[PDB]
Amino acid sequence: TIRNSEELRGKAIEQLEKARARLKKVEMDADQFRVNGYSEIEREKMNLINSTYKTLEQFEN
Amino acid sequence: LEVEAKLAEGRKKIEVELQEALGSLEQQKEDTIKSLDSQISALSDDIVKKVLP
């Protein structure tokens, strides 16, 4: 009982620690991915802000 | 909203860009027609000489 119980609590606390490190990785993942995705949403927006002048010129001709 | 404002800007630009050239062309063709009215009498004669031998 003591070997299996210490094994259970030890494995579960090491699960806490390794999934805590994995939590650190996911927090960094979300922060970095928001830093990336801001750029792509601004990219499609600026595609619109240029395409308005593009269609302006297309009808200017 | 801002590209709708640009869509509106295109119209403000087109009114000037058309009407100014249009006024120039109207007055130009009017000057050219009333100028030719002194010369069309002479320019009619070659057609006469062409049709009749």
Side-chain angles (χ1 to χ4, degrees):
Chain A
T1 317
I2 193 52
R3 305 329 307 133
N4 286 76
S5 54
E6 298 274 72
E7 175 53 86
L8 178 86
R9 60 164 286 208
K11 179 67 174 65
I13 289 159
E14 304 327 296
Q15 206 296 325
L16 300 177
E17 263 66 72
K18 62 162 198 299
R20 183 180 295 171
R22 181 219 31 78
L23 174 141
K24 271 301 151 282
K25 309 201 315 290
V26 185
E27 304 301 292
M28 185 71 263
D29 182 285
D31 218 357
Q32 192 66 342
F33 181 62
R34 87 187 71 158
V35 169
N36 293 103
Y38 281 140
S39 297
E40 283 94 12
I41 74 163
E42 283 321 298
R43 273 160 184 174
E44 61 91 23
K45 289 201 176 76
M46 71 180 84
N47 295 355
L48 272 84
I49 312 182
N50 281 175
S51 72
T52 176
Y53 190 100
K54 303 298 114 176
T55 190
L56 276 191
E57 191 276 301
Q58 173 177 346
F59 284 86
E60 271 277 5
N61 263 327
Chain B
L1 291 175
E2 67 203 26
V3 295
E4 174 274 349
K6 296 178 178 73
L7 162 59
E9 176 272 315
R11 268 63 173 170
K12 323 163 167 52
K13 175 165 214 269
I14 184 180
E15 313 314 321
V16 178
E17 202 180 345
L18 306 198
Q19 298 300 73
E20 264 70 2
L22 180 138
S24 157
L25 295 158
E26 294 299 326
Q27 275 56 83
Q28 172 49 242
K29 299 320 148 165
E30 290 175 63
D31 261 348
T32 316
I33 176 62
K34 58 186 161 289
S35 68
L36 261 173
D37 210 318
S38 44
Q39 295 174 359
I40 49 148
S41 86
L43 309 188
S44 177
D45 180 302
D46 63 84
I47 311 194
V48 194
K49 214 63 57 173
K50 183 76 169 191
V51 289
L52 296 106

